[PDB]
Ligand binder design. Structure first.
Ligand SMILES: CC(=O)N[C@@H]1[C@@H](O)[C@H](O[C@@H]2O[C@H](CO[C@]3(C(=O)O)C[C@H](O)[C@@H](NC(C)=O)[C@H]([C@H](O)[C@H](O)CO)O3)[C@H](O)[C@H](O)[C@H]2O)[C@@H](CO)O[C@H]1O
Ligand SMILES: CC(=O)N[C@@H]1[C@@H](O)[C@H](O[C@@H]2O[C@H](CO[C@]3(C(=O)O)C[C@H](O)[C@@H](NC(C)=O)[C@H]([C@H](O)[C@H](O)CO)O3)[C@H](O)[C@H](O)[C@H]2O)[C@@H](CO)O[C@H]1O
Ligand SMILES: CC(=O)N[C@@H]1[C@@H](O)[C@H](O[C@@H]2O[C@H](CO[C@]3(C(=O)O)C[C@H](O)[C@@H](NC(C)=O)[C@H]([C@H](O)[C@H](O)CO)O3)[C@H](O)[C@H](O)[C@H]2O)[C@@H](CO)O[C@H]1O
Ligand SMILES: *[C@@H]1O[C@H](CO)[C@@H](O[C@@H]2O[C@H](CO)[C@@H](O)[C@H](O)[C@H]2NC(C)=O)[C@H](O)[C@H]1NC(C)=O
Ligand SMILES: *[C@@H]1O[C@H](CO)[C@@H](O[C@@H]2O[C@H](CO)[C@@H](O)[C@H](O)[C@H]2NC(C)=O)[C@H](O)[C@H]1NC(C)=O
Ligand SMILES: *[C@@H]1O[C@H](CO)[C@@H](O[C@@H]2O[C@H](CO)[C@@H](O)[C@H](O)[C@H]2NC(C)=O)[C@H](O)[C@H]1NC(C)=O
Ligand SMILES: *[C@@H]1O[C@H](CO)[C@@H](O)[C@H](O)[C@H]1NC(C)=O
Ligand SMILES: *[C@@H]1O[C@H](CO)[C@@H](O)[C@H](O)[C@H]1NC(C)=O
Ligand SMILES: *[C@@H]1O[C@H](CO)[C@@H](O)[C@H](O)[C@H]1NC(C)=O
Ligand SMILES: *[C@@H]1O[C@H](CO)[C@@H](O)[C@H](O)[C@H]1NC(C)=O
Ligand SMILES: *[C@@H]1O[C@H](CO)[C@@H](O)[C@H](O)[C@H]1NC(C)=O
Ligand SMILES: *[C@@H]1O[C@H](CO)[C@@H](O)[C@H](O)[C@H]1NC(C)=O
Ligand SMILES: *[C@@H]1O[C@H](CO)[C@@H](O)[C@H](O)[C@H]1NC(C)=O
Ligand SMILES: *[C@@H]1O[C@H](CO)[C@@H](O)[C@H](O)[C@H]1NC(C)=O
Ligand SMILES: *[C@@H]1O[C@H](CO)[C@@H](O)[C@H](O)[C@H]1NC(C)=O
Ligand SMILES: *[C@@H]1O[C@H](CO)[C@@H](O)[C@H](O)[C@H]1NC(C)=O
Ligand SMILES: *[C@@H]1O[C@H](CO)[C@@H](O)[C@H](O)[C@H]1NC(C)=O
Ligand SMILES: *[C@@H]1O[C@H](CO)[C@@H](O)[C@H](O)[C@H]1NC(C)=O
Lengths: 316, 170, 170, 316, 170, 316
């Protein structure tokens, strides 16, 4: 006598939201927000440099913990909490900008500046930089006065960048523990150091005095830097208190840099990284870490947003 | 839904229908039987899966670190960065919520629609050999055996053959 | 609208209908009368109010000052901040305009739909005891008194009782 | 003979926009963009500190107008146009960053640094800081030479942060009106002041000379600051021209800070604030002030965006 | 589409129909003829063009340079600017993709709807003087000459005149 | 016997995307993303100043190449790659901020500062600034010591802004090629220069030494600037090595500034500009240049996004 039309259904559906309604049940649904983390740095197929105890900025100056990273090459660069940029106490001016440059550099290639010296010492060391006895930053030279209290002659050294890419140049300024110890190392008087490139124009007078003991030492070294363009020339006029560059750095290509406290893993692949690991997902959104980097789903505040993949569930 | 079939003039779904999304359940001399409609089921499935493939993709756009988790950046620049990131988070959180809600509204209406399209197809086949029950069912005046029921399901039912007898039985 | 009832095959609305959104207006031996349909009115109202509750909410996301109205911040950082704020304003201004427009399109179509669902329900009840006028009205062949009209409105109308007399009066 | 189906309608509807159409009339509609301001700071239920004539940065140093705000506690902090951070003319280096820190601090708790002095004066005052006669910044000490033209001995004072939260440290640098008046106060020669923390490394040589008369005075005091981490030590080497901290500040918790020219009101509650008052609303958008802060509707450029809550109006 | 006419129970469109979007093609004693329906064509055209006018507009919002193409800004501020710009690009690229996709879905459904509205209008006119073919066509029992066909197209067809003869020819 | 309903169609449609489907063909469609560039700066109806060889910052100081731009007036300002801000080698501190101020200034009006000098020279020139023989920055004055090695008296000059809008003030600091050549020009000793406004507080000690030869010269001049508010006073205390302002600049109104390498065209009108030209379009989006400025379509990464303007195409 008859024929009826119907549709499928379940006892229990999956709740989802619509424009009209909160929590309507449907036959099937799927998640749009990724919550699953992988607690490793998934580096399969990538030239990876895990810096460990080397601070990223130390790759340019060369404290002993960075001796194996002086000319690294990389697609992915990993910074660690235990990393240190220095051996002798000190810091970099404009430090975070430089980190950003080096994170995407693809690594660094080094080349001699060509400085030669007359009428001064060039082999200053310290106990804070240990290479089987006292040493110094591998890429730098501690410029001194020939003997104690001896004058430091007003010097002018120059370096032209003869390559096709910009050169990263770093120099330092030593602030001694006292007014006396500055005169001992570089002679008395007001020491000045100046720096002039096509793009750049600055000067540096030192400032000795007592700092708190770091690594057992109360002296400090400022580190400064600039990018020298192709065919541009840079000049250093200095009366003393100057840590001279021995080599210049050039950027190899492209990379990405991350900060992390988890192990490397060459068995998994990923392009979205955070300090807790890797987000492997094709979902458009994620609720794991708003500071994740690489190629990532968009961060959202919601833990879950279910997309209906079935009709409305209308049970018996 | 907008088309008033699913959770509308059809009372409910069938939990026995594991064959597909939509189907027919008949009654006749031989008894009751139930079967799924491939075309309607497949049209809904294809449309939904096409939504998925469109949304389940990640962009090739790379972003880098602009702050630091081990060595805090200067406070002023740090506050600008955080304000900007939080502003962006608020935009995406809105976009995600709105996307899924509007997609979900459309998905439910889309399934409702496909049911209606199937219901109307069948009505159009029967052509005065049947009348509307009103619960999503067609009362057939002439005798329709299992062979006859299958012809309706497969779109091979000739209304002109059974017309006179069904017409008379009005 | 998409369903072609409101501002479609129904000429216009009734300003006398203060009872609800949708209703019936009949004509018979006893004269004319008008009444509202609760179920349809309520389904539309519930759906619209559910849109509202979803949109009329403010986020728990806090933002702080990143510039200064009494002591201007440095110009470069100030220009970055303003550029970013203006960029965000442009995004939200777009989002708001698009949200309301698409919601409004859906709300009008949704109301059109509910009218159609009600119209079709009634047709399905009458089952060959009536025919379509085409202006959103049903011409009834048999005699339908006020008691009979109320039965249609309350879904208790038995078509089989009046069938023969209406059929004959074709 | 018949039964007709219809829907309700009005003579006049409310115009709204759709994807297809501008100004279609509907039966009912509602506003999504807030325009109603309340011209008060709605502070019901909130620990509120209205700074008035005290500048926010003055809570740390203590000019007379900030004497009642030296250890304030707050959920909401209100800055006023009449606020001043100083009594003796001067300003802060990195001033806006510090304001941002203090706005969300929840207020400040103060503690003695512990500095004791020998061979110098510590009680320098001025007419610009008035507490029944001449005075100075309550939390600071103007360090001088015992007598006129007398040398200022190269000093080294230190302070370790022994608490669990970072310490806000402020010091100052006095630039006198002339080259002569600097020698009078601190003796002749090139005065230097240095500052060294784990995170921080800087120095400060003064610069006397004539400035325009502010508060009747042509001298200036620079104010400088850093955040000292738990268990970290900070050291001050100075030859003179140094305004020494007496107390250190610690942050209490959480707050929000606003700028405003309208009265406080404890009869209304709100979480969205601007200089003109409070936005009380549950609408998703607002067209009152793009710089509103707290928990606010999103700012949009449109004054009005009406949402249909009824069917299309089709009148007789 | 959602309404199941275009690429639904109508097999295909007519490449001969250059008159408008929708139309009638008849068969009778005088032969075959084809003509366009103005009202339906115009309603679809007006709705689509109204989408266009709404989207084809540019904002009066001015933005200025915050970086420099001849003299690079400082690296840190430059990286914040680029990160922010790229973040904004990602938002607009999403907005544009979503807008066009959802508009396109609605435009196709809107055209499907208008076809259905026209089909249903005609059915409602004929009132038991015709039956549904099921391919988007109406088999007419009584004789309908070119004069008669035009009356249907122009909404002037009186079903009561031809009723008895069509009814009998069932 | 019958009457059939149908719709129009084509042999070939235009592919578009939907929520459900990639590449569904429709009867007609239209582009939403602008790709058409006009390779000129469309400046019809706009007061336009093409700076050419004049650098934008040079309009304030006045090197010879900027002599015709000292008081320009503009709606649109165009910077060129060949532009130079200097004649005598040097740069500006806070340079990009100042550019941003001048780009939207509507141009500049100049007014004498009113400085008069006694006991010194004021007519210093150089071969790098050529106006039929050696000259200097038109708006500045090179302040010297009366004769070689002669002392430079500690000076104090002031200027009050008596106008309703803020005054742009620029001064310079000359760093000579050597320690000797500084004493020759301004006498021996440590030269200091200080600057104090209501908003502003800073100082400047010079730093002579050898820089690379630019324009044949190894000296440099720093240029510094501040905005002086209405009724505010600014004072300059200087011991030498100071390039004094002759005139102050005031901002005329409103403009927009662009950078470009293409020609001006007064036959076309546009409001959206980039270095490659003008985007003339009413489409909501563009894929030409993400750094375009003015009133522009939004930049998107997609080259094309077609909007359906017709029904689905269903051919025979
Ligand atoms: C050898 C000598 O003349 N004096 C010895 C003292 O140096 C020594 O006192 C200890 O000194 C330690 C610092 O020593 C260095 C260092 O940093 O390791 C030694 C470096 O050769 C010296 N380098 C240069 C280029 O001058 C370096 C430098 O002067 C300072 O770092 C500058 O700030 O100092 C350290 O301070 C110890 O705590 C201290 O006891 C005493 C005692 O061992 O013996 C002397 O013979
Ligand atoms: C008492 C004395 O030796 N000389 C008196 C002059 O000071 C006074 O000239 C007036 O001086 C005013 C400034 O005086 C102070 C101040 O700021 O109020 C007084 C402070 O004790 C002093 N403090 C310290 C630590 O030295 C302070 C300080 O030197 C400067 O502020 C540093 O810039 O100066 C003010 O300039 C008046 O305009 C001026 O007339 C004269 C006349 O009253 O009487 C002298 O006995
Ligand atoms: C006239 C004189 O006393 N000495 C002549 C030398 O100057 C000259 O050496 C050449 O000097 C060139 C620089 O000359 C200027 C300049 O910049 O053009 C000349 C300016 O008058 C002088 N201005 C002032 C205010 O002092 C200016 C200034 O001292 C420096 O720019 C400061 O840095 O220097 C240039 O360096 C040439 O390369 C150099 O050969 C010699 C040879 O021509 O003749 C002397 O009579
Ligand atoms: C910007 O936001 C970050 C978090 O995204 C803040 O860093 C956090 O600070 C809290 C409170 O001190 C710590 O508990 C977390 O360990 C920090 N998280 C990270 C990822 O660093 C940071 O303080 C904010 N910046 C500023 C300037 O306030
Ligand atoms: C950033 O934008 C703000 C406004 O949001 C600018 O401040 C306004 O400047 C105009 C013109 O001088 C004044 O009329 C208003 O009183 C200011 N409003 C506020 C709230 O401060 C500010 O100038 C812009 N920043 C920069 C660096 O140009
Ligand atoms: C920010 O992005 C811009 C591009 O939008 C970068 O400038 C480009 O740099 C590349 C590589 O050196 C050059 O090939 C282009 O000529 C540059 N384009 C423009 C428009 O300047 C810029 O380097 C980025 N900023 C930072 C700090 O990395
Ligand atoms: C329905 O309820 C049962 C009760 O245990 C639960 O396990 C199940 O997940 C529910 N079904 C669905 C589809 O969520
Ligand atoms: C239901 O959807 C999920 C998505 O999470 C999918 O994995 C699964 O295959 C689907 N199952 C059925 C029966 O459709
Ligand atoms: C460093 O160099 C000087 C001579 O230039 C030499 O006399 C001295 O011994 C060297 N220092 C060391 C530790 O060998
Ligand atoms: C640098 O100069 C040399 C001339 O010695 C030339 O070969 C090279 O092409 C120049 N490169 C640039 C970028 O100026
Ligand atoms: C219709 O017009 C009257 C004329 O005064 C006006 O007051 C009223 O607001 C209008 N109705 C609606 C609902 O807007
Ligand atoms: C119409 O909507 C408004 C929203 O502003 C609401 O306050 C009111 O109660 C509604 N009135 C009716 C009659 O629906
Ligand atoms: C400040 O201290 C000195 C001794 O340290 C004292 O002689 C002098 O009187 C004090 N100043 C004042 C105003 O009491
Ligand atoms: C600081 O050092 C003391 C040891 O005196 C210790 O009790 C405390 O836990 C330390 N805290 C931190 C954060 O290092
Ligand atoms: C269909 O194909 C022809 C083949 O040349 C092509 O030229 C034409 O553009 C296509 N039609 C449409 C509307 O794209
Ligand atoms: C098709 O759309 C385009 C938009 O690019 C328009 O220019 C043209 O007039 C339209 N043509 C037809 C036949 O509708
Ligand atoms: C500059 O001025 C001095 C006197 O103030 C004068 O003697 C000298 O000749 C002037 N310089 C030139 C080049 O005329
Ligand atoms: C500046 O001061 C003068 C008094 O000489 C007065 O006429 C003018 O109104 C003042 N303007 C401002 C902005 O203070």
């Amino acid at each position: 006598d008859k024929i009826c039309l119907g549709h499928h259904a379940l006892s229990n559906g999956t709740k989802v939201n619509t424009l009209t309604e909160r929590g309507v049940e449907v036959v099937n649904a799927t998640e749009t927000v990724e919550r699953t983390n992988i607690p490793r740095i998934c580096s399969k197929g990538k030239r990876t440099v895990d810096l460990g105890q080397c601070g990223l900025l130390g790759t340019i100056t060369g404290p002993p913990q960075c001796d194996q990273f002086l000319e690294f090459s990389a697609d992915l660069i990993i910074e660690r909490r235990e990393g240190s940029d220095v051996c002798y106490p000190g810091k970099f001016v404009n430090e975070e900008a430089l980190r950003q440059i080096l994170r995407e550099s693809g690594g660094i290639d080094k080349e001699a500046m060509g400085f030669t010296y007359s009428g001064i010492r060039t082999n200053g060391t310290t106990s804070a930089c240990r290479r089987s006895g006292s040493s110094f930053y591998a890429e730098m030279k501690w410029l001194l006065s020939n003997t104690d209290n001896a004058a430091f002659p007003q010097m002018t050294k120059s370096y032209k960048n003869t390559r096709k890419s910009p050169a990263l140049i770093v120099w330092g300024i030593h602030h001694s523990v006292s007014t006396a110890e500055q005169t001992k190392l570089y002679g008395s008087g007001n020491k000045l150091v100046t720096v002039g490139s096509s793009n750049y124009q600055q000067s540096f007078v030192p400032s000795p005095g007592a700092r708190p003991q770091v690594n057992g030492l109360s002296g400090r070294i400022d580190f400064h830097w600039l990018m020298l363009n192709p065919n541009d020339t840079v000049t250093f006029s200095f009366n003393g208190a100057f840590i001279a560059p021995d080599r210049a750095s050039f950027l190899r290509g492209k990379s990405m840099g991350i900060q992390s406290g988890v192990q490397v893993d060459a068995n998994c692949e990923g392009d979205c990284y955070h300090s807790g690991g890797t987000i492997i997902s094709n979902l458009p959104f994620q609720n794991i870490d708003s500071r994740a980097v690489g190629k990532c789903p968009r961060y959202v505040k919601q833990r879950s947003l279910l997309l209906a993949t079935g009709m409305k569930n209308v049970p018996e | 839904g907008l088309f008033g079939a699913i959770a509308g003039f059809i009372e409910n779904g069938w939990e026995g229908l594991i064959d597909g999304w939509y189907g027919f359940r008949h009654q006749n001399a031989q008894g009751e039987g139930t079967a799924a409609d491939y075309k309607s089921t497949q049209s809904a499935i294809d449309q939904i899966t096409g939504k998925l493939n469109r949304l389940i993709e990640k962009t090739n756009q790379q972003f880098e670190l602009i702050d630091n988790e081990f060595n805090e950046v200067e406070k002023q620049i740090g506050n600008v960065i955080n304000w900007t990131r939080d502003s962006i988070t608020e935009v995406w959180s809105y976009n995600a919520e709105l996307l899924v809600a509007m997609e979900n509204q459309h998905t439910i209406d889309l399934a409702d629609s496909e049911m209606d399209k199937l219901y109307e197809r069948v009505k159009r086949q029967l052509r005065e050999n049947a009348e509307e029950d009103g619960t999503g069912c067609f009362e057939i005046f002439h005798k329709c055996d299992d062979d006859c029921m299958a012809s309706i399901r497969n779109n091979t039912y000739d209304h002109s053959k059974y017309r006179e007898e069904a017409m008379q039985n009005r």
